[PDB]
Amino acid sequence: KVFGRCELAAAMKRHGLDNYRGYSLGNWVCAAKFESNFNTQATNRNTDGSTDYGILQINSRWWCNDGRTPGSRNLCNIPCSALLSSDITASVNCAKKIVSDGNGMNAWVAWRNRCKGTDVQAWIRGCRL
Numbered sequence: 181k182v183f184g185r186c187e188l189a190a191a192m193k194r195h196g197l198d199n200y201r202g203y204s205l206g207n208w209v210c211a212a213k214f215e216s217n218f219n220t221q222a223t224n225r226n227t228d229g230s231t232d233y234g235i236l237q238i239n240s241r242w243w244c245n246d247g248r249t250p251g252s253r254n255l256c257n258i259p260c261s262a263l264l265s266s267d268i269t270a271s272v273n274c275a276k277k278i279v280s281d282g283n284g285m286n287a288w289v290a291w292r293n294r295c296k297g298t299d300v301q302a303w304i305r306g307c308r309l
């Protein structure tokens with residue numbers, strides 16, 4: 181599924197991302213745009229063999245099982261394919277664990293370079309929330 185901006189904001193708010201560990205909702209919408217272009221089916225291979233999956237490009241090195249990243253962990257206890265579904269529940273729950281692990285939202289490269297320090301409220305402006 182390719183989400184609209186306001187559609188995704190509403191879905192993310194419903195699963196409790198708005199102000200999760202102090203990160204306002206516009207930060208999450210901004211990250212998703214630049215990580216995946218709002219597309220749940222996005223995948224991208226990294227140079228060490230791992231792959232990033234879904235709307236927030238979660239990495240098979242630590243977080244999910246894709247059967248081909250040898251000696252990795254699966255700390256969200258899921259197959260990486262559950263992270264490509266049109267329902268974002270599994271992506272959101274896994275991201276809650278990541279953003280809590282000590283590095284906050286800096287774990288998402290595109291957030292650090294394109295969203296951090298900007299007007300992030302602009303990404304939910306106009307939405308009926």
Ligand SMILES: C[C@@H](O)CN1CCN(CC(=O)O)CCN(CC(=O)O)CCN(CC(=O)O)CC1
Pocket residue numbers: 242255281282283
């Ligand atoms: C809870 C998360 O920390 C899980 N974590 C994966 C788990 N392992 C081992 C472990 O963390 O016990 C990888 C080890 N490694 C450095 C280290 O921890 O020493 C990774 C660092 N990051 C996060 C961080 O630690 O900042 C990756 C996420």
Ligand SMILES: C[C@@H](O)CN1CCN(CC(=O)O)CCN(CC(=O)O)CCN(CC(=O)O)CC1
Pocket residue numbers: 282
């Ligand atoms: C093995 C190294 O990771 C040693 N580690 C010291 C041991 N403990 C906990 C533990 O690691 O079992 C520290 C807790 N902690 C992070 C965490 O683990 O959750 C501090 C951050 N860093 C590393 C990191 O986690 O990125 C400190 C280095």
Ligand SMILES: [Cl-]
Pocket residue numbers: 204205206207300301302304
């Ligand atoms: Cl915001």
Ligand SMILES: [Cl-]
Pocket residue numbers: 245246247248249250251252
């Ligand atoms: Cl694997």
Ligand SMILES: [Cl-]
Pocket residue numbers: 191266267268269
């Ligand atoms: Cl959803």
Ligand SMILES: [Cl-]
Pocket residue numbers: 201283284285
């Ligand atoms: Cl933080």
Ligand SMILES: [Gd]
Pocket residue numbers: none
């Ligand atoms: Gd770690």
